[PDB]
Design an enzyme around this catalytic site. Structure first.
Site, mmCIF file in Angstrom:
data_model
loop_
_atom_site.group_PDB
_atom_site.id
_atom_site.type_symbol
_atom_site.label_atom_id
_atom_site.label_comp_id
_atom_site.label_asym_id
_atom_site.label_seq_id
_atom_site.Cartn_x
_atom_site.Cartn_y
_atom_site.Cartn_z
ATOM 1 N N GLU A 98 -0.230 -1.650 -5.907
ATOM 2 C CA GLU A 98 -1.513 -1.074 -5.566
ATOM 3 C C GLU A 98 -1.592 0.419 -5.900
ATOM 4 O O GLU A 98 -1.215 1.269 -5.069
ATOM 5 C CB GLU A 98 -1.768 -1.278 -4.085
ATOM 6 C CG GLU A 98 -1.575 -2.704 -3.641
ATOM 7 C CD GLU A 98 -1.795 -2.855 -2.156
ATOM 8 O OE1 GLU A 98 -1.223 -3.778 -1.525
ATOM 9 O OE2 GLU A 98 -2.518 -2.007 -1.608
ATOM 10 N N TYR A 99 -2.129 0.753 -7.076
ATOM 11 C CA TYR A 99 -2.697 -0.216 -8.028
ATOM 12 C C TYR A 99 -2.492 0.243 -9.472
ATOM 13 O O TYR A 99 -2.539 1.443 -9.759
ATOM 14 C CB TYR A 99 -4.209 -0.412 -7.804
ATOM 15 C CG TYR A 99 -4.639 -1.026 -6.485
ATOM 16 C CD1 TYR A 99 -4.659 -2.398 -6.323
ATOM 17 C CD2 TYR A 99 -5.054 -0.233 -5.415
ATOM 18 C CE1 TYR A 99 -5.045 -2.979 -5.124
ATOM 19 C CE2 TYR A 99 -5.440 -0.807 -4.214
ATOM 20 C CZ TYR A 99 -5.438 -2.189 -4.069
ATOM 21 O OH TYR A 99 -5.846 -2.805 -2.888
ATOM 22 N N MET A 112 -6.843 -10.043 -3.346
ATOM 23 C CA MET A 112 -7.088 -9.417 -2.044
ATOM 24 C C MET A 112 -8.592 -9.223 -1.715
ATOM 25 O O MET A 112 -9.147 -8.083 -1.635
ATOM 26 C CB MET A 112 -6.327 -8.117 -1.966
ATOM 27 C CG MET A 112 -4.852 -8.367 -2.035
ATOM 28 S SD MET A 112 -3.905 -6.868 -1.816
ATOM 29 C CE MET A 112 -4.629 -5.907 -3.137
ATOM 30 N N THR A 113 -9.198 -10.395 -1.505
ATOM 31 C CA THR A 113 -10.596 -10.580 -1.175
ATOM 32 C C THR A 113 -10.830 -10.375 0.326
ATOM 33 O O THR A 113 -11.244 -11.285 1.051
ATOM 34 C CB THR A 113 -11.069 -11.979 -1.580
ATOM 35 O OG1 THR A 113 -10.170 -12.949 -1.044
ATOM 36 C CG2 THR A 113 -11.080 -12.121 -3.081
ATOM 37 N N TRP A 117 -3.336 -13.146 5.071
ATOM 38 C CA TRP A 117 -2.815 -11.798 5.281
ATOM 39 C C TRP A 117 -3.182 -11.362 6.688
ATOM 40 O O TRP A 117 -4.319 -10.996 6.927
ATOM 41 C CB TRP A 117 -3.398 -10.839 4.224
ATOM 42 C CG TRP A 117 -3.068 -9.356 4.365
ATOM 43 C CD1 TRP A 117 -3.946 -8.343 4.630
ATOM 44 C CD2 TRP A 117 -1.782 -8.737 4.211
ATOM 45 N NE1 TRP A 117 -3.288 -7.140 4.663
ATOM 46 C CE2 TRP A 117 -1.956 -7.357 4.421
ATOM 47 C CE3 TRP A 117 -0.492 -9.221 3.929
ATOM 48 C CZ2 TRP A 117 -0.892 -6.454 4.369
ATOM 49 C CZ3 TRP A 117 0.559 -8.327 3.881
ATOM 50 C CH2 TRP A 117 0.354 -6.958 4.094
ATOM 51 N N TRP A 143 0.814 -1.201 0.000
ATOM 52 C CA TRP A 143 0.000 0.000 0.000
ATOM 53 C C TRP A 143 0.848 1.251 0.000
ATOM 54 O O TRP A 143 0.607 2.188 -0.771
ATOM 55 C CB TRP A 143 -0.921 -0.025 1.214
ATOM 56 C CG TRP A 143 -1.725 1.218 1.459
ATOM 57 C CD1 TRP A 143 -1.470 2.205 2.392
ATOM 58 C CD2 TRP A 143 -2.924 1.611 0.778
ATOM 59 N NE1 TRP A 143 -2.453 3.180 2.330
ATOM 60 C CE2 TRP A 143 -3.360 2.831 1.357
ATOM 61 C CE3 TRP A 143 -3.703 1.030 -0.237
ATOM 62 C CZ2 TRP A 143 -4.514 3.495 0.921
ATOM 63 C CZ3 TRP A 143 -4.858 1.707 -0.677
ATOM 64 C CH2 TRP A 143 -5.240 2.921 -0.096
#
Length: 370
Positions: free
Chosen positions: A145-146, A210-211, A350, A104
């Site tokens: 990202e992203y 990344m659910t 994660w 991030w």
């Protein structure tokens, strides 16, 4: 082409959170997984770069905190988290470790990198195989990202930048692992529609999807909702924001099933000040967390805020004025059963540090899969 059980190890875990590589061993985690991503390496001047030099290779571990049980030495060539990873693979030889770049915070540099991809690729390979720790890593993970969309920063590199970068990596990494972590936004005009992930798909070994973080206390007044729902449900604030709808989006674009892993968050997101027993209601603001508001590790939430319900294939927790949502051993198992029916390549965690000391979240993920 067999089943992958992956999790992320965070570099800064070794500081204030006191979560070390020895922990993957004592929790039994190392016995049940197949891959580890080390997070994160930086991206500077269009090249791969080290993230935290002290943590990655210089820190001296003591006898009682190290994986092998022996203290590091001054004369030692390698030290820090990398040496510990070295000590772990010696114990658990089937494990493969990838070095992960971006995140991030450090994804701002990918645009300069996407302007000369062969240079980016070459630089990364040379770092992953630096003579100081050659042997330790089995491949590279790109957590951008992203691409052609907005994260901490907005990128406008076009839909084919991501492909170019991956192709380059494949060219210079050969038969080693090249994976990437990807957005789970399947909505119209969303993040998946923004980049050609199907085209890049042929160069990667798989995608880490990344659910999770679909909803959370950045919408501080609510409405409250599970951050990692499997399927849609009636109250959902934004249509199409579910694990299931993310997978389908990739599949529809042409990414094959065995190039997809399902993401599991070992943490919960929560609000405080709720009227009702279940999600959908308003809130005063973010529930109080340890390292940041609105977020808490499972090892902690399992005690402070025990699960009281289920919605959309995941779990929720009411306790006082707080509403938290996170995955449990039982919701993880049903989610894995779903991944198998779907023919996914596997799933991932994660991150490791949020799991308990007996590693019961990672144990559920592992046992659920083919």
């Amino acid at each position: 082409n067999g089943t992958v059980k992956l999790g992320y190890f965070t570099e800064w875990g070794t500081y204030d959170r006191n979560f070390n590589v020895k922990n993957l061993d004592t929790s039994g985690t190392a016995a049940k997984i197949t891959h580890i991503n080390y997070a994160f390496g930086n991206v500077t001047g269009g090249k791969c770069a080290i993230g935290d030099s002290y943590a990655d290779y210089d820190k001296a571990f003591t006898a009682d905190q190290s994986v092998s049980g022996q203290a590091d030495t001054w004369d030692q060539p390698l030290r820090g988290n990398f040496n510990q990873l070295r000590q772990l693979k010696a114990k658990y030889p089937h494990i493969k470790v990838l070095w992960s770049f971006g995140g991030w915070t450090w994804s701002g540099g990918f645009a300069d990198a996407a302007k000369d991809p062969q240079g980016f690729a070459q630089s990364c390979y040379n770092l992953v195989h630096d003579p100081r720790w050659d042997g330790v890593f089995d491949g590279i993970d790109i957590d951008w990202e992203y691409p052609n969309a907005c994260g901490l920063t907005c990128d406008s590199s076009g839909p084919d930048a991501f492909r170019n970068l991956m192709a380059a990596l494949r060219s210079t990494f050969g038969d080693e692992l090249v994976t990437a972590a990807v957005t789970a936004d399947g909505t119209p005009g969303g993040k998946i529609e923004a980049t050609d992930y199907a085209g890049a798909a042929q160069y990667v070994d798989w995608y880490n999807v990344m659910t999770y973080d679909f909803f959370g206390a950045w919408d501080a007044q609510g409405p409250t909702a599970p951050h990692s729902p499997l399927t849609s449900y009636d109250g959902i604030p934004k249509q199409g924001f579910t694990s299931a709808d993310a997978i389908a989006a990739f599949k529809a674009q042409g990414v094959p099933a065995d190039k997809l892993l399902l993401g599991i968050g070992f943490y919960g997101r929560g609000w405080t000040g709720v009227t009702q027993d279940a999600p959908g209601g308003t809130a005063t603001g973010p529930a109080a967390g340890t390292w940041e508001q609105g977020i808490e590790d499972y090892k902690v939430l399992k005690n402070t805020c025990p699960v009281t319900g289920t919605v959309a294939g995941t779990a929720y927790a009411h306790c006082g004025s707080n509403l938290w949502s996170y995955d449990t051993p039982d919701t993880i198992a049903s989610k894995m059963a779903w991944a198998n029916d779907q023919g996914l390549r596997g799933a991932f965690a994660w991150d490791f540090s949020g799991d308990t000391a007996d590693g019961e979240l990672i144990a559920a993920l592992s046992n659920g899969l083919a």
